[PDB]
């Protein structure tokens, strides 16, 4: 049951370094990252999955300043994924998406391929020329990916925690992003929790539906 | 189990108006909206859940102009959820968030309630006083809610489609969201697809992992 998973999941404050992810779960984590939906299937993202202790130590360098309380989570967890968004939407990426949709057989006639590319460009240009927020629109898609991911890993029987508490500039310089056209937004350490986790015993807190919801 | 859901779920292009959500599923989707995570448990959102023919007509008014291709989805779906974000993060709302965490039993000492409030304000101030990307940071959390919701409703045996193709100005004014302190971002119709949904039989297409993923 998925509601049980939504009510029982939590943001893990401490992981067990010994409890590693099985090769099956390690593959499944990558499937969730790839198959997440996005506006017009633009998929303006990049993922860095750190499984080695040397790779996790490289990611943990972003939380070395005033974000020290987030360092231990990034090293003790089995798999650590950093979510990156595109800095700008190029015509080459819009071409890469539609050619991949064509290779997969989503279009019957080549005219339908052009109709899809036109509609995608209509949305992409509205954000590039008119609204001037392509960087925010693409980052919004990556945040949708994080939402899909957290629920997916909680349902896989794995513990995770989303981290916004890191210096993005240090993480960009450690992996050579920006020059490659990407920016780090969220870091999600995945694995299993330990007994030092002061959040697994604590109840879940959310505002009531009378304040945040209206039915019409 | 959810890997199966993530690989099988799709964006429905046509719904069946007679196929309604069971009374329990209608309560389950609302739980999914609320129990979603957000940075510092800030929950900078509001949800309008349209289930009546009159309520869905009010939402469908935003599917005008070059967004006419989304009118059917908003009217034929059983339930239509409008994801809204706060326009500005006020201090009275940050107080509402900590007081709810105090009534749920997350803090043992009053020193723990003052420590979380400080930790919330550190992040809140970094976005409203320093970076000035307050509306964008809150909008990101709302998109995180959508990702959680899409995979969530898909695991419930329901069909859905996230919509960005609508007029935010029309929707906002129709529900008077601006004066209440909110803005509409994503509209998600929930129900069951009809035989006219070409996307139900079409294969899922995503970019390969050799382009979007790097293992370290
Ligand atoms: C985008 C995002 C950023 C977050 N950043 C942090 C962080 O830097 N450190 C941390 O310990 N928790 C962080 N969290 C966890 C939240 O505090 C947590 O999701 C929220 O309190 C709700 O609790 P829950 O996850 O147990 O439901 C973040 C959550 C989200 C979704
Ligand atoms: C934020 C967002 C906005 C979208 N807007 C629309 C829309 O206005 N109309 C539509 O038919 N599909 C829309 N989609 C559906 C995408 O095209 C779809 O997610 C993508 O093609 C991948 O296909 P899938 O969802 O079946 O995996 C949107 C998706 C997201 C996540
Ligand atoms: O949900 C309320 C609480 O249970 C915990 N809140 C957080 O998840 C949370 C907690 C912290 N701190 C508190 C400053 Br001493 C670090 C200790 Br874990 C911070 N932070 O300041 O980085 C951010 C979030 N954050 O979410 O960004």
How do strand A45-50 and strand B213-215 relate by DSSP bridges? Answer: parallel
Question: How is residue A37 written in tokens?
Answer: 């939906």
Which residue, among B23, B101, B146, has the nearest Cα to A150 in the 3D structure?
B146
CA distance B156 to A151: 13
Question: How is residue B127 written in tokens?
Answer: 């976005």
Which method was it determined by? X-ray
Question: How many angstroms is the resolution?
Answer: 2.5
Count the residues in chain B.
216
Helix (H) / strand (E) element for B106: namely none
CB < 8 Å to A164, chain B: 39, 123
Cβ(B115) – ligand 3 distance below 6 Å:
yes
Number of domains in chain A: 1
CB < 8 Å to A216, chain B: 48-52, 54-55, 58
Residue B108 belongs to what domain range?
A: 1-216
Which residue among the candidates A53, A136, A164, A196 is catalytic per the annotation?
A: A164
CA distance B187 to B174: 14
How many angstroms separate the Cα of B181 from the Cα of each of B48, B56, B85? 14, 22, 8
CA distance B133 to A191: 32
CA distance A180 to A178: 5
Separation of CA A67 and ligand 3 centre (Å): 10
β-partners of residue B159 are B191
- E-only strand ranges, chain A: 45-50, 79-86, 159-160, 182-191, 213-215
For the four alpha carbons of A148, A153, A155 and A160, in that order, the dihedral sign comes to: negative
CA distance B152 to B162: 13
Question: How is residue A115 written in tokens?
Answer: 């109709």
Q: Which ligand has the nearest atom to the CA of A160? A: 1
Structure-token match 């499937």, residue found: A31
Helix axis angle for A23-34 and A134-154, nearest 10°, is 150
β-partners of residue B191 are B159
Largest CA distance in chain B: 59
Question: How is residue B123 written in tokens?
Answer: 């992040």
CA distance A67 to A62: 8
In whole angstroms, what separates CA B7 from the centre of its chain? 21
Q: Is B37 left (phi over 0), alpha (psi -120 to 50) or beta?
A: beta
CA distance A99 to A144: 24
Q: Pick from B112, B116, B138 the residue to mutate for probing ligand 3's pocket: most ligand atoms within 8 Å of its CB.
A: B116
CA distance B172 to B176: 6
Residue minimizing CA distance to atom 6 of ligand 3: B40
CB A47 within 8 A of CB A33: yes
Residues 6+ apart with CB under 8 A from B71: B60, B63, B64
Q: What are phi and psi of A186, to 5 degrees?
A: -135, 150
CB A2 within 8 A of CB B152: yes
Instruction: Tell me which of B13, B37, B55, B187 to substitute to probe the interface with A (most A C-beta atoms closer than 10 Å).
Output: B37
In whole angstroms, what separates CA B101 from the centre of its chain? 22
Cβ(B37) – ligand 1 distance below 6 Å:
yes
CATH number (domain holding residue B63)? 3.40.109.10
CB B177 within 8 A of CB B84: yes
CA distance A65 to A147: 27
Please give, rounded to a whole number of angstroms, the shortest distance from the CA of A103 to a CA of chain B. 9
3-state SS, A83-119, equals: EEEECCCCHHHHHHHHHHHHHCCCCCCHHHHHHHHHH
Letter string b/e over residues B64-77, b meaning 16 or more CB atoms within 10 A of that residue's CB: eeebeebbbbbbbb
β-partners of residue B182 are B86
β-partners of residue A11 are A160
Residues 6+ apart with CB under 8 A from B20: B78, B191
CB B161 within 8 A of CB B12: yes
Residues 6+ apart with CB under 8 A from B154: B5, B6, B8, B9, B160
Please give, rounded to a whole number of angstroms, the shortest distance from the CA of B58 to a CA of chain A. 9
B130 DSSP 8-state letter: I
Helix (H) / strand (E) element for B187: namely strand B182-191
CB B79 within 8 A of CB B191: yes
Burial zone of A29 (CB within 10 Å; 0-12 exposed, 13-18 middle, 19+ buried): buried
């Amino acid at each position: 049951d998925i509601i049980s998973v939504a009510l029982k999941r939590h943001s893990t404050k401490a992981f067990d370094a010994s409890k590693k992810l099985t090769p099956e779960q390690a593959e499944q984590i990558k499937t969730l990252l790839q198959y997440s939906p996005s506006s017009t299937n633009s998929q303006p993202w990049h993922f860095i999955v750190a499984s080695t202790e040397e790779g996790k130590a490289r990611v943990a360098k972003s939380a070395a300043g005033n974000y020290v309380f987030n360092e231990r989570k990034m090293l003790d967890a089995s798999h650590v994924v950093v979510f990156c968004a595109k800095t700008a939407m190029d015509d080459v990426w819009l071409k890469l998406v539609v050619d991949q949709e064509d290779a997969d057989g989503r279009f019957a006639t080549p005219e339908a391929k052009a109709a899809n590319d036109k509609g995608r460009k209509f949305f992409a240009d509205m954000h590039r020329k008119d609204l001037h927020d392509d960087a925010e629109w693409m980052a919004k898609q990556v945040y949708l990916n994080v939402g899909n991911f957290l629920l997916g890993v909680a349902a896989l029987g794995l513990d995770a925690v989303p981290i916004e508490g890191f210096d993005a500039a240090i993480l960009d310089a450690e992996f050579g992003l920006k020059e490659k056209g990407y920016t780090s937004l969220v870091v999600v350490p995945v694995g299993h929790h330990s007994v030092e986790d002061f959040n697994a015993t604590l109840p879940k807190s959310r505002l009531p539906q009378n304040i945040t919801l209206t039915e019409v």
